[PDB]
Design a protein around this motif. Structure first.
Motif, PDB file in Angstrom:
ATOM      1  N   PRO D  76       0.826  -1.209   0.000  1.00  0.00           N
ATOM      2  CA  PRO D  76       0.000   0.000   0.000  1.00  0.00           C
ATOM      3  C   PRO D  76       0.864   1.264   0.000  1.00  0.00           C
ATOM      4  CG  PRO D  76       0.393  -0.616   2.211  1.00  0.00           C
ATOM      5  CD  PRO D  76       1.097  -1.657   1.367  1.00  0.00           C
ATOM      6  N   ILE D  77       0.252   2.395  -0.335  1.00  0.00           N
ATOM      7  CA  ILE D  77       0.948   3.664  -0.248  1.00  0.00           C
ATOM      8  C   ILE D  77       0.060   4.600   0.506  1.00  0.00           C
ATOM      9  CG2 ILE D  77       2.065   3.349  -2.419  1.00  0.00           C
ATOM     10  CD1 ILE D  77      -0.026   5.233  -3.625  1.00  0.00           C
ATOM     11  N   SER D  78       0.611   5.744   0.878  1.00  0.00           N
ATOM     12  CA  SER D  78      -0.146   6.723   1.622  1.00  0.00           C
ATOM     13  C   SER D  78      -0.565   7.833   0.695  1.00  0.00           C
ATOM     14  CB  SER D  78       0.693   7.306   2.757  1.00  0.00           C
ATOM     15  OG  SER D  78       0.812   6.377   3.813  1.00  0.00           O
ATOM     16  N   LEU D  90      -6.522  11.540   5.178  1.00  0.00           N
ATOM     17  CA  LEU D  90      -5.405  10.668   4.855  1.00  0.00           C
ATOM     18  C   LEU D  90      -5.703   9.147   4.860  1.00  0.00           C
ATOM     19  CD1 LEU D  90      -2.464   9.831   4.535  1.00  0.00           C
ATOM     20  CD2 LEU D  90      -2.188  10.348   6.969  1.00  0.00           C
ATOM     21  N   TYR D  92      -3.581   6.268   5.126  1.00  0.00           N
ATOM     22  CA  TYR D  92      -2.222   5.830   5.379  1.00  0.00           C
ATOM     23  C   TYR D  92      -1.947   4.431   4.755  1.00  0.00           C
ATOM     24  CZ  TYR D  92       1.983   4.551   8.038  1.00  0.00           C
ATOM     25  OH  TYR D  92       3.232   4.109   8.416  1.00  0.00           O
ATOM     26  N   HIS D  93      -2.883   3.505   4.934  1.00  0.00           N
ATOM     27  CA  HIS D  93      -2.774   2.177   4.345  1.00  0.00           C
ATOM     28  C   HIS D  93      -3.724   2.034   3.146  1.00  0.00           C
ATOM     29  CE1 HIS D  93      -0.407  -1.233   6.351  1.00  0.00           C
ATOM     30  NE2 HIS D  93       0.096  -0.134   6.886  1.00  0.00           N
TER      31      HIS D  93
ATOM     32  N   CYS F  23       5.306   4.967  13.742  1.00  0.00           N
ATOM     33  CA  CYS F  23       4.907   4.605  12.376  1.00  0.00           C
ATOM     34  C   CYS F  23       4.839   3.104  12.103  1.00  0.00           C
ATOM     35  CB  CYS F  23       5.850   5.263  11.359  1.00  0.00           C
ATOM     36  SG  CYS F  23       5.982   7.050  11.519  1.00  0.00           S
ATOM     37  N   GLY F  25       4.853   0.070   9.859  1.00  0.00           N
ATOM     38  CA  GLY F  25       5.422  -0.047   8.530  1.00  0.00           C
ATOM     39  C   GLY F  25       5.928  -1.423   8.151  1.00  0.00           C
ATOM     40  N   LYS F  29      10.682  -1.828   4.108  1.00  0.00           N
ATOM     41  CA  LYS F  29      10.305  -0.605   3.405  1.00  0.00           C
ATOM     42  C   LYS F  29      10.645   0.603   4.291  1.00  0.00           C
ATOM     43  CE  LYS F  29       6.852  -1.491  -0.258  1.00  0.00           C
ATOM     44  NZ  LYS F  29       6.006  -0.456  -0.945  1.00  0.00           N
ATOM     45  N   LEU F  31      10.208   4.555   5.974  1.00  0.00           N
ATOM     46  CA  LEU F  31       9.130   5.325   6.596  1.00  0.00           C
ATOM     47  C   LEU F  31       9.412   6.833   6.516  1.00  0.00           C
ATOM     48  CD1 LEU F  31       8.543   2.903   9.605  1.00  0.00           C
ATOM     49  CD2 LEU F  31       6.962   3.318   7.751  1.00  0.00           C
ATOM     50  N   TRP F  52       3.898   8.796   7.127  1.00  0.00           N
ATOM     51  CA  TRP F  52       3.716   8.673   5.678  1.00  0.00           C
ATOM     52  C   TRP F  52       4.545   7.499   5.152  1.00  0.00           C
ATOM     53  CZ3 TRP F  52       0.525  11.388   2.314  1.00  0.00           C
ATOM     54  CH2 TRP F  52       0.805  11.321   0.936  1.00  0.00           C
ATOM     55  N   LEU F  53       4.011   6.785   4.163  1.00  0.00           N
ATOM     56  CA  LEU F  53       4.612   5.525   3.718  1.00  0.00           C
ATOM     57  C   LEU F  53       5.603   5.589   2.561  1.00  0.00           C
ATOM     58  CD1 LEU F  53       1.946   2.753   4.065  1.00  0.00           C
ATOM     59  CD2 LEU F  53       4.039   3.214   5.367  1.00  0.00           C
TER      60      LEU F  53
END
Ligand code: NAG
Ligand code: NAG
Ligand code: NAG
Ligand code: NAG
Ligand code: NA
Lengths: 91, 105, 72, 105, 75, 91
Positions: D76-78, D90, D92-93, F23, F25, F29, F31, F52-53
């Motif tokens: 996933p991206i944010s 937002l 986040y996942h 966070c 995560g 990956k 963070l 934020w990812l």
């Protein structure tokens, strides 16, 4: 849905020898029974009996019958509880 | 042209597995054939990514490809095969040999 | 809380269908001229927020049969 | 080259998502590019089915196709996006937008 | 209980590799003449039992470097 | 790995207002931290700060800086604990 269990090679593979088996199977897939034996000119030695998975070769076939001409190992499958109790041969 | 499950009767003799598969002699593996065409039908279980990629492809059909139609779920089949010492034995749950469900990824 | 939508598309098992919301979508694939499908949708609400591009237009609504009298 | 993970910078403006994605403006989704050529490398996680199909295709290259190179795992991206009432919020996942691992199926 | 095999193939990160067993495999993809790869393998032992067809030959063994002096045919 | 948490819209979205965030995560990956604010000709109203990812735009960037020319919503991300405490603008 049930089948006849048998395994001549039981001692070696560490499994029961004879009895029955309830067939674990996928939601909307069919279930079957199999039997397999050796045939040294008329003398029949059993090798294995048990549950078998949705294979179209067995589709809607009441009795357990083998179809191969002259095989090392004779095999047959069928559909219907304990249909593998008795089995026969005819190519 | 659309993405779906297809019959694929594999015959073990054809791929030279007749050497150790005693039964069956052939079996129904399926094939996943067809294109993932926008919009993506629900019954194709599109992933977000598949969606995005599909869109991007609509804009850059030469640099980016459609999503592929692949097996998304796999049933096992039963097989009677020769031991390492030639003993008929049985894998009842021989995993991942037949197509259950198709989809776009 | 389902609803009923008009269904003019290839993946159509009937003249109408039921779903979460109704869709009208315009697409250019393959070089061909644009084609316009109408149907259901329950998977990716976000797609509807899509601003129309030079090759696709996703439009959705959630009142009964709300995707008949409507083109793009 | 073979079957592998490739860079795919997706720009939301390009697919018209700039309307509601505030950030990022573009992000790395990957692509799964390449062919599934026998023998199938372990790092491609070949399914049994994929193997069988691949073989059959070797014999019937006109009736049966190679396995496809598809995303097999998804990160996933944010993203920061406009509410139904235009409020920056937002996820986040945001699931399944980027390619984690590739494979043959 | 790993072993070391010769590695003559495209997916080769070196001149040799380590794995569960060693492979020599011969393939005849449509139109193209047959090519012969040598390498490792730890995934699908069954493939080895494969009787050689008109388009492929899978051969495996599990002694050190056992896949150098060795070539194959089809049918 | 930690960030500065802030959400002006908190009341409305039923979340905390300000503080910090550890966070969650993926194994291997990266963070990041983000901040976003509005800018009505010099007057800065904060809108959101937080985790934020793994997004390459933030890769190896020590300070939280926004790069867009003139945006509705200013955004910036960065890498490193609490890197989003302070933020700035420069296209
Ligand atoms: C043999 O069957 C019995 C049930 O009849 C069961 O308790 C036992 O687990 C079996 N032994 C095995 C699977 O080796
Ligand atoms: C061998 O076995 C079958 C039963 O499985 C029997 O009916 C058959 O006549 C026997 N003889 C042959 C044909 O070898
Ligand atoms: C607000 O923050 C505290 C810890 O700092 C946490 O315990 C609580 O669950 C948070 N509120 C919500 C509902 O997310
Ligand atoms: C608004 O605020 C930013 C953020 O500090 C500042 O750098 C910028 O000069 C201001 N923009 C204008 C020109 O109004
Ligand atoms: Na706000």
């Amino acid at each position: 849905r049930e089948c006849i269990y048998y395994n001549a090679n039981w001692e070696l593979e560490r499994t029961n020898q004879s009895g029955l088996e309830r067939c674990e199977g996928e939601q909307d897939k069919r279930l079957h029974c199999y039997a397999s034996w050796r045939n040294s000119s008329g003398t029949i030695e059993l090798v294995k009996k048990g549950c078998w998975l949705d294979d179209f070769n067995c589709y809607d076939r009441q009795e357990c019958v083998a179809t191969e001409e002259n095989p090392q190992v004779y095999f047959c499958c069928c559909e219907g509880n304990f249909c593998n109790e008795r089995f026969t041969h005819l190519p | 042209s659309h993405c779906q499950k297809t019959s694929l009767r594999v015959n073990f003799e054809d791929i030279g597995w007749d050497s150790w598969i005693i039964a069956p002699k052939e079996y129904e593996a399926y094939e996943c054939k067809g294109g993932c065409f926008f919009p993506l039908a629900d019954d194709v279980t599109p992933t977000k990514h598949a969606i995005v990629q599909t869109l991007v492809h609509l804009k850059f059909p030469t640099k980016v490809g459609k999503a592929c139609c692949v097996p998304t779920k796999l049933s096992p089949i039963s097989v009677l095969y020769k031991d390492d010492m030639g003993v008929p034995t049985l894998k009842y749950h021989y995993e991942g040999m037949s197509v259950a469900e198709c989809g776009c990824r | 809380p389902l609803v009923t939508c008009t269904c003019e598309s290839p993946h159509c098992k009937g003249p109408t269908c039921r779903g979460a919301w109704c869709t009208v979508v315009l697409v250019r694939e393959e070089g061909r001229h644009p084609q316009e499908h109408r149907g259901c949708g329950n998977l990716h609400r976000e797609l509807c927020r899509g601003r129309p591009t030079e090759f696709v237009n996703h439009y959705c609504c959630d009142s009964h049969l709300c995707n008949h009298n409507v083109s793009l």
